[PDB]
């Protein structure tokens, strides 16, 4: 078995190997990459996402989210308070202000220590989940707006044509902005490209051990667990690496820098934080190996998780027994 310790693997495809996205994902899996739940892909030196980032300041963040924490430093939830709209230029200036800017630090480890010590005492503003793309239309390799759609994959694997679309999303971050522990909708893959700015640190639990994280989360968030049998779908709970180590949960960590892709694999729980002002683009995707994960994915039916239009068909076709309850949650 390849990668039996479930380490995060880093890949350096050549420009030739960067042509066929599906083939390269299958290659990475042949080497055991999925066992970690997360992989890094460093593009060939010849590749670029677009020519410059000079003209992005007029993108609108219609609903910036202030991420307010409750709990203790290593075990907390966050809620998202909606803020007035602002442009990317306005948000960048805010991120760089004394109130929100990255503190002085020695290296990524020192910054990680400061994050876990102090996150809860601040409420950073995240421009998350903005439909759109920063890939130039002429970028033909690993252009996250030109991937094969998940509806087409389901159709190719299962023979059933379904409604829905699959488009990318932009994330504008600042110091301390946080993504809570989660797997993707329907335990899909994700791919994330850091277009510009400061790094993003990731934490990930191997898919084969995801249920250990869920059991700890039920213990640490006992009200939330009673509320919903899949409350990590709410994407609000944070657990630090120190707490994970104290409870014997297997995990790994890695820091993504500008110009790098990350891939999350089906049922790979992940969480993390931004180091400073940045912009990422991410999208879900599927492969043949996803199908069985999609069939077994948990679902939130309490009403909190509320998701996209396109999830309906995935539940309806892959999980018909759960469909009625799940849809009641959506309505």
Which residues define the annotated binding site for Fe cation? 182, 184, 270
CB of 312 to Zn ion, least distance (A): 17
- How many residues touch ligand OGA under the rule CB under 6 A: the total is 8
Q: Judge residue 72's burial from the number of C-beta atoms within 10 Å of its C-beta, 0-12 exposed, 13-18 middle, 19 or more buried.
A: exposed
Residue 228 in the binding site for Zn ion (CB under 5 A) = yes
d(CA 273, CA 252) in angstroms, rounded, equals 14
CA proximity to 76, closest of 23, 122, 27, 127: 122
CB of 320 to ligand OGA, least distance (A): 27
Residue in 16, 58, 321, 331 binding Mg ion, rule: CB under 5 A = 58
Residues 250-289 that bind ligand OGA (CB under 6 A): 264, 270, 280, 282
Helix (H), strand (E) at residue 256: strand 252-256
Q: Which is nearer to Ni ion, 100 or 268 (CB)?
A: 268
Q: Which residues are annotated as a binding site for Zn(2+)?
A: 228, 234, 300, 302
Residue 171 binding target from Ni ion, ligand OGA, Zn ion, none, CB below 5 to 8 Å by type: ligand OGA
In sequence order, which ranges of the chain are alpha helices (DSSP H)?
Answer: 21-30, 88-95, 108-118, 150-158, 210-220, 222-227, 241-246, 290-296, 311-318, 320-330
Q: Which is nearer to Ni ion, 190 or 301 (CB)?
A: 190
d(CA 67, CA 64) in angstroms, rounded, equals 10
Q: What is the DSSP secondary-structure string of 51-110? A: S-STT-TT-EESS-EEEEEEEETTEEEEEEEE---EEHHHHHHHHTSTTTSPPP-SSHHH
Give the x-and-dash track for 164-203 against Ni ion (CB under 5 A).
Answer: --------------------------x-------------
Residue 302 binding target from Mg ion, Zn ion, ligand OGA, none, CB below 5 to 8 Å by type: Zn ion
CB of 3 to ligand OGA, least distance (A): 20
Retrieve residue 44's tokens.
């060939």
- Summarize as ranges the residues that interact with ligand OGA (CB under 6 A): 171, 179, 190, 192, 264, 270, 280, 282
Query: Which residues are at the interface with Mg ion (CB under 5 A)?
Result: 56, 58-59
């Amino acid at each position: 078995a390849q990668n039996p310790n479930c380490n995060i693997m880093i890949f350096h495809p050549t420009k030739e190997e960067f042509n066929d996205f599906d083939k390269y994902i299958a290659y990475m899996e042949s080497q055991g990459a999925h066992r970690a739940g997360l992989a890094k892909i460093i593009p060939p030196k010849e590749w670029k996402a677009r020519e410059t980032y000079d003209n992005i300041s007029e993108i609108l963040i219609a609903t910036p989210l202030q991420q307010v924490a409750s709990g203790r430093a290593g075990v907390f939830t966050q809620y998202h308070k909606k803020k007035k709209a602002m442009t990317v230029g306005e948000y960048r200036h805010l991120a760089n202000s004394k109130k929100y800017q990255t503190p002085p630090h020695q290296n990524f480890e020192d910054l990680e220590r400061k994050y876990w010590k102090n996150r809860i005492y601040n409420s950073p503003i995240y421009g998350a989940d903005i439909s759109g793309s920063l890939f130039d239309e002429n970028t033909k390799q690993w252009n996250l707006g030109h991937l094969g759609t998940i509806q087409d994959l389901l159709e190719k694997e299962c023979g059933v044509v379904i409604e829905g679309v699959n488009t990318p999303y932009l994330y504008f971050g600042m110091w301390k902005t946080t993504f809570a522990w989660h797997t993707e909708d329907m335990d899909l893959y994700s791919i994330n490209y850091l277009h510009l700015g400061e790094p993003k640190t990731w934490y990930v639990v191997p898919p084969e051990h995801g249920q250990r994280l869920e059991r700890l989360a039920r213990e640490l968030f006992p009200g939330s667990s009673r509320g919903c049998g899949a409350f990590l779908r709410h994407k609000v709970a944070l657990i630090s690496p120190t707490v994970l180590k104290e409870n014997g949960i297997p995990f790994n960590r890695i820091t993504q820098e500008a110009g790098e892709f990350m891939v999350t694999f089906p049922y790979g729980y992940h969480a993390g934080f931004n180091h400073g002002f940045n912009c990422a683009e991410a999208i879900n995707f599927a492969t043949p190996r996803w199908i069985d994960y999609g069939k077994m994915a948990s679902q939130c039916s309490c009403g909190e998780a509320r998701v996209t239009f396109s999830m309906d068909a995935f539940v309806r076709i892959l999980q018909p027994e759960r469909y009625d309850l799940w849809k009641r949650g959506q309505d």
